[PDB]
Design an enzyme around this catalytic site. Structure first.
Site, PDB file in Angstrom:
ATOM      1  N   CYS A 157      -2.299  -1.009   6.418  1.00 37.34           N
ATOM      2  CA  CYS A 157      -1.436  -1.357   5.305  1.00 37.34           C
ATOM      3  C   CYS A 157      -1.848  -0.727   3.967  1.00 37.34           C
ATOM      4  O   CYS A 157      -1.112  -0.909   2.989  1.00 37.34           O
ATOM      5  CB  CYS A 157      -1.381  -2.878   5.159  1.00 37.34           C
ATOM      6  SG  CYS A 157      -0.904  -3.804   6.614  1.00 37.34           S
ATOM      7  N   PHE A 208       5.376  -8.530  10.712  1.00 37.51           N
ATOM      8  CA  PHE A 208       5.420  -7.092  10.941  1.00 37.51           C
ATOM      9  C   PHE A 208       6.800  -6.646  11.409  1.00 37.51           C
ATOM     10  O   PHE A 208       7.340  -7.189  12.376  1.00 37.51           O
ATOM     11  CB  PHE A 208       4.367  -6.691  11.968  1.00 37.51           C
ATOM     12  CG  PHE A 208       2.965  -6.692  11.432  1.00 37.51           C
ATOM     13  CD1 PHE A 208       2.724  -6.449  10.088  1.00 37.51           C
ATOM     14  CD2 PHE A 208       1.881  -6.929  12.275  1.00 37.51           C
ATOM     15  CE1 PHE A 208       1.423  -6.437   9.594  1.00 37.51           C
ATOM     16  CE2 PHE A 208       0.579  -6.926  11.789  1.00 37.51           C
ATOM     17  CZ  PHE A 208       0.350  -6.681  10.447  1.00 37.51           C
ATOM     18  N   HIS A 302       1.982  -3.728  -2.195  1.00 39.21           N
ATOM     19  CA  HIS A 302       2.162  -3.921  -0.761  1.00 39.21           C
ATOM     20  C   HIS A 302       2.190  -5.406  -0.436  1.00 39.21           C
ATOM     21  O   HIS A 302       1.199  -6.105  -0.694  1.00 39.21           O
ATOM     22  CB  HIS A 302       1.060  -3.240   0.042  1.00 39.21           C
ATOM     23  CG  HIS A 302       1.089  -3.598   1.493  1.00 39.21           C
ATOM     24  ND1 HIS A 302       1.939  -2.986   2.389  1.00 39.21           N
ATOM     25  CD2 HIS A 302       0.412  -4.539   2.195  1.00 39.21           C
ATOM     26  CE1 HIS A 302       1.770  -3.522   3.587  1.00 39.21           C
ATOM     27  NE2 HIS A 302       0.854  -4.471   3.495  1.00 39.21           N
ATOM     28  N   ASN A 335       6.668  -6.865   6.629  1.00 39.05           N
ATOM     29  CA  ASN A 335       5.526  -5.983   6.414  1.00 39.05           C
ATOM     30  C   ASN A 335       5.655  -4.796   7.362  1.00 39.05           C
ATOM     31  O   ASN A 335       5.546  -4.954   8.580  1.00 39.05           O
ATOM     32  CB  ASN A 335       4.228  -6.759   6.647  1.00 39.05           C
ATOM     33  CG  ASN A 335       2.967  -5.935   6.379  1.00 39.05           C
ATOM     34  OD1 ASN A 335       2.959  -4.710   6.481  1.00 39.05           O
ATOM     35  ND2 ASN A 335       1.889  -6.624   6.049  1.00 39.05           N
TER      36      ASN A 335
HETATM   37  O1  LIG Z   1      -2.402  -4.516  13.840  1.00 39.37           O
HETATM   38  C1  LIG Z   1      -1.759  -3.492  13.141  1.00 39.37           C
HETATM   39  C2  LIG Z   1      -0.257  -3.702  13.030  1.00 39.37           C
HETATM   40  C3  LIG Z   1       0.149  -2.490  12.305  1.00 39.37           C
HETATM   41  C4  LIG Z   1       1.679  -2.221  12.428  1.00 39.37           C
HETATM   42  C5  LIG Z   1       2.585  -2.964  11.732  1.00 39.37           C
HETATM   43  C6  LIG Z   1       3.918  -2.678  11.882  1.00 39.37           C
HETATM   44  C7  LIG Z   1       4.338  -1.673  12.702  1.00 39.37           C
HETATM   45  C8  LIG Z   1       3.395  -0.945  13.416  1.00 39.37           C
HETATM   46  C9  LIG Z   1       2.099  -1.232  13.273  1.00 39.37           C
HETATM   47  O2  LIG Z   1      -0.191  -2.633  10.989  1.00 39.37           O
HETATM   48  C10 LIG Z   1      -1.512  -3.055  10.728  1.00 39.37           C
HETATM   49  C11 LIG Z   1      -2.002  -3.045   9.431  1.00 39.37           C
HETATM   50  C12 LIG Z   1      -3.254  -3.441   9.198  1.00 39.37           C
HETATM   51  O3  LIG Z   1      -3.756  -3.436   7.806  1.00 39.37           O
HETATM   52  C13 LIG Z   1      -4.070  -3.878  10.254  1.00 39.37           C
HETATM   53  C14 LIG Z   1      -3.581  -3.885  11.496  1.00 39.37           C
HETATM   54  O4  LIG Z   1      -4.359  -4.337  12.678  1.00 39.37           O
HETATM   55  C15 LIG Z   1      -2.295  -3.475  11.721  1.00 39.37           C
END
Ligand SMILES: O=C1C[C@@H](c2ccccc2)Oc2cc(O)cc(O)c21
Ligand SMILES: O=C1C[C@@H](c2ccccc2)Oc2cc(O)cc(O)c21
Lengths: 389, 389
Positions: A157, A208, A302, A335
């Site tokens: 993120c 998400f 964010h 998100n």
């Molecule tokens: O576990 C993943 C999920 C990923 C995501 C979200 C939406 C679509 C695809 C992938 O985003 C993340 C952000 C993080 O700061 C830590 C994470 O462990 C994840």
């Protein structure tokens, strides 16, 4: 013997976005989620999820996974069973394809031929491969074979700030350079069934969503030909104190797993002030301007979750309208990890135009883009808006 | 409101390298490999491997995997059986740890306190994680919490050129910036047993070794305080024609798999001339210098394999001594993917010093660093040496 450098600040010249067509309303999600996962007998688990959906300040999200797609691939509806090859065989094609949608929208808007793109930064937390999503996207778009590419995998993120931090130097240090920036995320990499001690993975299921955003970033916009919307003026990266293990993500045989071992909202909101204050001190030093107040900046933040936004807004004493553009994007797509700040940037400029505010940044000259992610890593970008009409 | 930029060309100020202690002599490898994999009954398979070891122009390689480590984890000695979680749980710690060795050697050599490092680029083809190897390395080294980090995952054998291409812009566009560049590769991510239709994976077993290299890259070296060894002057990236699917690498439940679907030496050697000729035309344009002949440049060339080196040397008509530094590194560590060109750069400057040649580049002013990998991607960096005594 040389590569000429550019002279003016790296500027955002166009923005495009894209989302999968399938829309899932948060009212409907606890039923859809628990239905498609064969888990409504989990009445206890089911209802605290109901409660987090209620408090998620997400109204809807766009998702690539359909009822039918999950119907046809049981190992994702299952929970913690071998699934990496199937998700990757989905994500390694669907992530660059979604990114190609956003990219074409940005390029059309920009108005120049696609061959003027000299660099590409492709950022994603969903899938890995060689050749990477950067090359797959270049193939889909038909970019010149000599574009200088960079794939940023497994970012998380904060990646939306990361791509701006890098693009700034590519644009500013190469005369004539035009950087395609793409962040594309698809949740098939992490979608699991629910469980009563995977409640990190539960919060993921509430917030998400999927989406991709694309920028054209260049220095020295050609006057009356190219149009700048924001300027990148200062960047900074920070590992927050006492945040070790706060946000972990592992790429495993069962897929990508998600972990929170700290109170992430407390960590960010307690330390964010000192970071912003230092950043603004550098951008507006005494030697001259005093830095604008927080309420006189535009905020592209964010939205990891509502609890982050609320405590940041509280600890910094931000007037309740400053995070409005941020909250609108989380409400309508959730998100989307690295892509989210660029949906917010796009939303903010579009309202500013629509409501005839004075600048692309809601009428304010300076602004902040913030990304948070594993580390705990905070990316800060001081932006300048551009005046309207 | 600004970040001052640097003025002079991004320069390499120090280089360190590191390898696992366990050494495996190529004379011994077909026995060790087939022994530890329960496969000597495969007499047919065994002997063409014998033949490729014979023609691999690798004498020894340093490998993290021991007889005992493979003894204790049967799923890597096996072939094509679930293994990703075990390798990752090895590589996500051993790759940053090997990189920390090289980094400490570079920093000691550089002579400045580690807190003067403002940026980090960590490049690897072995393992992925969040937070990444960049953050793990920063933690191991104790860098300031605000270093601007970048992790380049799943790059492949062109990554050594990629990190220079990016570091050039970070160093040149940020006054005072000092970039730690680390490439670290460990072969536990791909080590499999042999099979008679995995003969792409067979060539991998003959050439791939382990190692890590680190650079300090900065513009405007402090006179009489910091020492430049090479200057980065021009970069270019190219996707070679008719190379789609030439080199693929997939991160799968059985681990990282390796594929060659084209004659990679023909593709590179047929197209490399036009690339070099164009690059030199840009660096030395008529409007002035004629570009130096190939034999009057120093060559830091990624040794994917002997067949690449031999056909490049043949198609460009290079005198037989020009690839000497490149071949020495492949002979004593094999193909270490992204780290290899930086071992070669280190070897070349060390001989130049030892033999009191006129420059860090074997007595020549200009040189070329080349990386090849999936794409088929070719990274070109025009370098300038620095004179000695
Ligand atoms: O576990 C993943 C999920 C990923 C995501 C979200 C939406 C679509 C695809 C992938 O985003 C993340 C952000 C993080 O700061 C830590 C994470 O462990 C994840
Ligand atoms: O299959 C991998 C192997 C990897 C490596 C080598 C040594 C140590 C660790 C990892 O390097 C590669 C380079 C490529 O251009 C394509 C690849 O598919 C690979």
């Amino acid at each position: 013997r040389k590569m000429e450098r550019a002279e003016g600040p790296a500027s955002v010249l166009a923005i495009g976005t894209a989302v999968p067509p399938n829309v899932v309303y948060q009212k409907d999600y606890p039923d859809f989620y628990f239905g498609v996962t064969n888990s409504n007998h989990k009445t206890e688990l089911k209802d605290k999820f109901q409660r987090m959906c209620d408090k998620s300040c997400v109204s809807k999200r766009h998702l690539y996974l359909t009822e039918e797609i999950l119907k046809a691939n049981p190992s994702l509806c299952a929970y913690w069973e071998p699934s990496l090859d199937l998700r990757q065989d989905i994500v390694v094609v669907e992530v660059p394809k979604l990114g190609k949608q956003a990219a074409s929208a940005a390029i059309k808007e920009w108005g120049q031929p696609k061959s003027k793109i000299t660099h590409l930064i492709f950022c994603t937390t969903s899938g890995v491969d060689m050749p990477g999503a950067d090359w797959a996207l270049a193939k889909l778009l038909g970019l010149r074979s000599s574009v200088k590419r960079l794939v940023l995998y497994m970012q998380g993120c904060y990646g939306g700030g990361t791509v701006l931090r890098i693009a700034k130097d590519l644009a500013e240090n190469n005369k004539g350079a035009r950087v395609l920036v793409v962040c594309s995320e698809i949740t098939a990499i992490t979608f699991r069934g629910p469980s009563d001690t995977h409640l990190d993975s539960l919060v993921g299921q509430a917030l998400f969503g999927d989406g991709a955003s694309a920028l054209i970033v260049g220095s020295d916009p050609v006057p009356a030909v190219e149009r700048a919307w924001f300027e990148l003026h200062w960047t900074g990266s920070d590992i927050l104190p006492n945040s070790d293990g706060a946000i972990d993500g592992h790429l495993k045989e069962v897929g990508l797993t998600f972990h929170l071992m700290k109170d992430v909202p407390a960590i960010i909101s307690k330390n964010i002030g000192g970071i912003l204050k230092d950043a603004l001190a550098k951008v507006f030093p005494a030697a001259a301007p005093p830095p604008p107040t927080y309420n006189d900046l535009f905020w592209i933040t964010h939205p990891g979750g509502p609890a982050i936004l609320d405590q940041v807004e509280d600890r910094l004493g931000l007037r309740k309208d400053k995070l409005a553009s941020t909250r609108a994007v989380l409400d309508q797509f959730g998100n989307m990890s690295s892509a989210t700040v660029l949906f917010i940037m796009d939303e903010m400029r579009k309202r500013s135009v629509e409501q005839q505010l004075g600048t692309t940044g809601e009428g304010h000259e300076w602004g902040l883009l913030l990304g948070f992610g594993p580390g705990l890593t905070c990316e800060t970008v001081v932006l300048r808006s551009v005046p309207l009409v």
